[PDB]
Coordinates of C-alpha atoms and ligand atoms in Angstrom, one line a residue:
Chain M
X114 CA 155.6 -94.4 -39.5
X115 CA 155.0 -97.0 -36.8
X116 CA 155.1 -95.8 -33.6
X117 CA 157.5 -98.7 -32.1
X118 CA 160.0 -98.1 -35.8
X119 CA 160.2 -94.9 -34.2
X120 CA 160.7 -96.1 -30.6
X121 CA 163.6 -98.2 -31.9
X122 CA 165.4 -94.7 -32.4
X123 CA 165.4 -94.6 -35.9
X124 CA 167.1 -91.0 -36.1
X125 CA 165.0 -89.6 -39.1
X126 CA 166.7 -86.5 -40.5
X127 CA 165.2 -84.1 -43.1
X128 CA 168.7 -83.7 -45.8
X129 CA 168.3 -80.2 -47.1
X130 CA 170.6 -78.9 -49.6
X131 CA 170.6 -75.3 -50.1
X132 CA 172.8 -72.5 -52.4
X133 CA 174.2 -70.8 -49.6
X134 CA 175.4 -73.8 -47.3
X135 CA 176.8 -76.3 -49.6
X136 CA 176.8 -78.8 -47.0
X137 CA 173.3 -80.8 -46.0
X138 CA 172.2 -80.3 -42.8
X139 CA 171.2 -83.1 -40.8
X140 CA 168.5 -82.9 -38.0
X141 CA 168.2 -86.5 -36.2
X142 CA 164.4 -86.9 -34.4
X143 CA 164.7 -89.9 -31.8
X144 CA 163.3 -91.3 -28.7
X145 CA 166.5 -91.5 -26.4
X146 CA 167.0 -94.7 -24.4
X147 CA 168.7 -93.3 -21.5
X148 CA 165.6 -91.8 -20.2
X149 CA 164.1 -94.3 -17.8
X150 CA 159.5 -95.8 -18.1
X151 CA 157.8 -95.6 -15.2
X152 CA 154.6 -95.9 -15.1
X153 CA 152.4 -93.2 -13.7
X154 CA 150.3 -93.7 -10.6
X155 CA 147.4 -91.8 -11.7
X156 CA 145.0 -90.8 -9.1
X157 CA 141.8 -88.8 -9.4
X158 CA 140.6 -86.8 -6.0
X159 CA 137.2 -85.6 -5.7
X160 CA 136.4 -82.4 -4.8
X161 CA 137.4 -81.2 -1.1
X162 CA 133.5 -81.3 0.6
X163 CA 134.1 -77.3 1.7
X164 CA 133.5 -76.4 -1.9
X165 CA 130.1 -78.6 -2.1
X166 CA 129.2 -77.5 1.0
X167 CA 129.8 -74.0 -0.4
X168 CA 127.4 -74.8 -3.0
Chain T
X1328 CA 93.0 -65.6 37.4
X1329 CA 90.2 -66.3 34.5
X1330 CA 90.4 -69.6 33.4
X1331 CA 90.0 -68.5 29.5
X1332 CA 92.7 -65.5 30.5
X1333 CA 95.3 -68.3 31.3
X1334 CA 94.3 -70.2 28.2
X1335 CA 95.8 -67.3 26.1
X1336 CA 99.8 -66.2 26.1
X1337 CA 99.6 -63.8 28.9
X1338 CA 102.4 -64.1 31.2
X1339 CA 102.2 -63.0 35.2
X1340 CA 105.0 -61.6 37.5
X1341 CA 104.9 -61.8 41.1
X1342 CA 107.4 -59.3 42.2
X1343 CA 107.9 -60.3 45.8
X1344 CA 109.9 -57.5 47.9
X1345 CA 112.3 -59.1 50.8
X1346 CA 115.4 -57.3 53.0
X1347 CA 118.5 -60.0 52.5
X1348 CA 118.1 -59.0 48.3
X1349 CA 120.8 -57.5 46.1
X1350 CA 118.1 -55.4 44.4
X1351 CA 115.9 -55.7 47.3
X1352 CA 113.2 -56.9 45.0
X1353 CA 112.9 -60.2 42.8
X1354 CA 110.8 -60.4 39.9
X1355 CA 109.5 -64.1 38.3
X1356 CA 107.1 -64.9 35.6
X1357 CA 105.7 -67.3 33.7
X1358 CA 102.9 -68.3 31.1
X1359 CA 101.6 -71.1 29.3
X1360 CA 104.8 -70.9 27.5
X1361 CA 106.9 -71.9 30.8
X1362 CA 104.1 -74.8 31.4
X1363 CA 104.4 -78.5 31.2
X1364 CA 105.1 -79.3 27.7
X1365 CA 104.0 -82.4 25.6
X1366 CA 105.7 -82.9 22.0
X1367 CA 109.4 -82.5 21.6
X1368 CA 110.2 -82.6 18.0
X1369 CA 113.9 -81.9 18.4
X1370 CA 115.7 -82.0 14.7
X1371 CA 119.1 -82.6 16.0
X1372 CA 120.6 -82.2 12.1
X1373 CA 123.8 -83.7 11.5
X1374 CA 126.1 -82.1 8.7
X1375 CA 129.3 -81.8 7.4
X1376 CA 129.0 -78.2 7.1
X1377 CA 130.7 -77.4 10.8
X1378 CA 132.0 -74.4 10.8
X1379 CA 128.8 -71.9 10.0
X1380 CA 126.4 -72.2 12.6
X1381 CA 122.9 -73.2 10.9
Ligands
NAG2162 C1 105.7 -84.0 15.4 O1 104.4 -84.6 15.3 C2 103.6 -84.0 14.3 C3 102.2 -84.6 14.5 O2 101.6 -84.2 15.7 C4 104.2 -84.2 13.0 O3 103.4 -83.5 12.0 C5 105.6 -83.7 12.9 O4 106.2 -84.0 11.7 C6 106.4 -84.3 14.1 N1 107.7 -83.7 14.1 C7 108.8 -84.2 13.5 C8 108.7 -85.5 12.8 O5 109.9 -83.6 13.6
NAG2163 C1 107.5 -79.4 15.3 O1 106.0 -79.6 15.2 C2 105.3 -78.4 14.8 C3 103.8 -78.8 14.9 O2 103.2 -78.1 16.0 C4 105.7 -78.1 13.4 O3 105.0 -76.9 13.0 C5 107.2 -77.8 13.3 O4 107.6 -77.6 12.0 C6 108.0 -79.0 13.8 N1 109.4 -78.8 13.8 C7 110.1 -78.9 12.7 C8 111.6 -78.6 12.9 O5 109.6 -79.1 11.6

Protein backbone atom coordinates (compact mmCIF):
# COMPACT_ATOMS: atom_id res chain seq x y z
CA UNK A 1 0.00 0.00 0.00
CA UNK A 2 0.97 3.60 -0.54
CA UNK A 3 2.90 5.00 1.89
CA UNK A 4 0.76 8.47 2.25
CA UNK A 5 -2.85 5.80 2.17
CA UNK A 6 -1.17 4.74 5.12
CA UNK A 7 -0.23 8.15 6.53
CA UNK A 8 -3.85 9.06 6.23
CA UNK A 9 -4.42 6.50 9.18
CA UNK A 10 -6.17 4.04 7.48
CA UNK A 11 -6.39 1.60 10.58
CA UNK A 12 -5.72 -1.79 8.75
CA UNK A 13 -6.74 -4.78 10.90
CA UNK A 14 -6.07 -8.42 10.18
CA UNK A 15 -10.05 -10.09 11.11
CA UNK A 16 -9.22 -13.50 12.43
CA UNK A 17 -11.83 -15.88 13.25
CA UNK A 18 -10.92 -18.78 15.23
CA UNK A 19 -12.91 -22.00 17.06
CA UNK A 20 -12.08 -21.02 20.39
CA UNK A 21 -12.90 -17.13 20.41
CA UNK A 22 -15.96 -16.85 18.45
CA UNK A 23 -15.53 -13.20 18.21
CA UNK A 24 -12.83 -11.65 15.49
CA UNK A 25 -10.26 -9.90 16.81
CA UNK A 26 -9.36 -6.67 15.50
CA UNK A 27 -5.80 -5.23 15.49
CA UNK A 28 -5.84 -1.51 14.06
CA UNK A 29 -1.98 -0.49 12.50
CA UNK A 30 -1.97 3.42 12.15
CA UNK A 31 0.20 6.43 12.06
CA UNK A 32 -1.29 8.62 14.96
CA UNK A 33 -1.83 12.33 14.27
CA UNK A 34 -1.23 13.58 17.62
CA UNK A 35 2.41 12.99 17.52
CA UNK A 36 3.94 16.21 16.26
CA UNK A 37 7.01 16.44 12.60
CA UNK A 38 9.85 18.10 13.20
CA UNK A 39 12.38 17.89 11.21
CA UNK A 40 15.74 16.74 12.39
CA UNK A 41 18.78 18.88 12.42
CA UNK A 42 21.25 16.38 11.36
CA UNK A 43 24.74 17.24 11.99
CA UNK A 44 27.91 15.13 11.22
CA UNK A 45 31.11 15.91 13.52
CA UNK A 46 34.43 14.82 12.56
CA UNK A 47 36.62 13.09 14.49
CA UNK A 48 38.04 14.96 17.72
CA UNK A 49 41.96 15.65 16.32
CA UNK A 50 43.35 13.73 19.79
CA UNK A 51 42.30 10.47 18.08
CA UNK A 52 44.24 11.41 14.70
CA UNK A 53 46.82 12.65 16.44
CA UNK A 54 46.85 9.28 18.24
CA UNK A 55 47.20 7.73 15.06
CA UNK B 1 97.90 24.66 21.83
CA UNK B 2 98.50 22.74 18.35
CA UNK B 3 96.67 24.34 15.79
CA UNK B 4 95.45 20.81 14.22
CA UNK B 5 94.73 19.70 18.24
CA UNK B 6 92.10 22.63 18.36
CA UNK B 7 90.82 21.65 15.00
CA UNK B 8 89.53 18.35 16.55
CA UNK B 9 86.66 18.13 19.63
CA UNK B 10 88.96 18.42 22.47
CA UNK B 11 87.77 20.58 25.09
CA UNK B 12 90.26 22.57 27.77
CA UNK B 13 89.69 23.57 31.44
CA UNK B 14 91.44 26.21 33.16
CA UNK B 15 90.76 25.53 36.66
CA UNK B 16 91.85 28.82 38.18
CA UNK B 17 92.22 28.60 42.24
CA UNK B 18 91.15 32.11 44.12
CA UNK B 19 90.30 32.78 48.19
CA UNK B 20 86.68 34.74 48.03
CA UNK B 21 85.29 31.11 46.27
CA UNK B 22 82.50 28.93 47.57
CA UNK B 23 84.54 25.87 46.42
CA UNK B 24 87.63 27.75 46.51
CA UNK B 25 88.33 26.65 42.97
CA UNK B 26 86.39 27.38 39.67
CA UNK B 27 86.57 25.18 36.78
CA UNK B 28 85.58 26.52 32.85
CA UNK B 29 85.88 24.82 29.60
CA UNK B 30 85.27 25.00 26.26
CA UNK B 31 85.94 23.52 22.58
CA UNK B 32 85.16 24.05 19.25
CA UNK B 33 81.80 23.10 20.26
CA UNK B 34 81.41 26.37 22.54
CA UNK B 35 82.95 28.43 19.44
CA UNK B 36 81.42 31.00 17.16
CA UNK B 37 78.87 29.14 15.23
CA UNK B 38 77.66 29.78 11.61
CA UNK B 39 74.34 27.80 10.35
CA UNK B 40 71.29 27.77 12.55
CA UNK B 41 68.88 25.42 11.02
CA UNK B 42 66.28 25.77 13.85
CA UNK B 43 63.04 23.49 12.90
CA UNK B 44 60.72 25.30 15.15
CA UNK B 45 57.72 22.54 14.31
CA UNK B 46 54.28 23.59 14.86
CA UNK B 47 51.65 20.83 15.71
CA UNK B 48 48.54 20.12 17.08
CA UNK B 49 49.80 17.37 19.04
CA UNK B 50 50.53 19.60 22.47
CA UNK B 51 50.50 17.67 25.08
CA UNK B 52 53.49 14.91 24.40
CA UNK B 53 56.61 16.62 24.11
CA UNK B 54 58.26 15.62 20.61
C1 LIG C 1 70.71 24.02 6.20
O1 LIG C 1 71.53 24.22 5.05
C2 LIG C 1 71.92 22.97 4.46
C3 LIG C 1 72.91 23.29 3.36
O2 LIG C 1 74.11 23.82 3.89
C4 LIG C 1 70.69 22.21 3.97
O3 LIG C 1 71.09 20.94 3.46
C5 LIG C 1 69.69 22.02 5.11
O4 LIG C 1 68.49 21.44 4.61
C6 LIG C 1 69.40 23.35 5.80
N1 LIG C 1 68.54 23.15 6.96
C7 LIG C 1 67.21 23.26 6.96
C8 LIG C 1 66.55 23.63 5.66
O5 LIG C 1 66.55 23.07 7.98
C1 LIG D 1 70.76 20.91 10.09
O1 LIG D 1 71.84 20.83 9.15
C2 LIG D 1 72.60 19.61 9.21
C3 LIG D 1 73.71 19.75 8.19
O2 LIG D 1 74.98 19.87 8.82
C4 LIG D 1 71.69 18.42 8.93
O3 LIG D 1 72.43 17.22 9.07
C5 LIG D 1 70.52 18.42 9.91
O4 LIG D 1 69.62 17.37 9.59
C6 LIG D 1 69.78 19.75 9.86
N1 LIG D 1 68.70 19.78 10.83
C7 LIG D 1 67.54 19.15 10.64
C8 LIG D 1 66.53 19.29 11.75
O5 LIG D 1 67.31 18.50 9.63
Amino acid sequence: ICEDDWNSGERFTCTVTHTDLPSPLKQTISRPKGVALHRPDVYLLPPAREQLNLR
Amino acid sequence: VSEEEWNTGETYTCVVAHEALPNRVTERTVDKSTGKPTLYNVSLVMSDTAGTCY
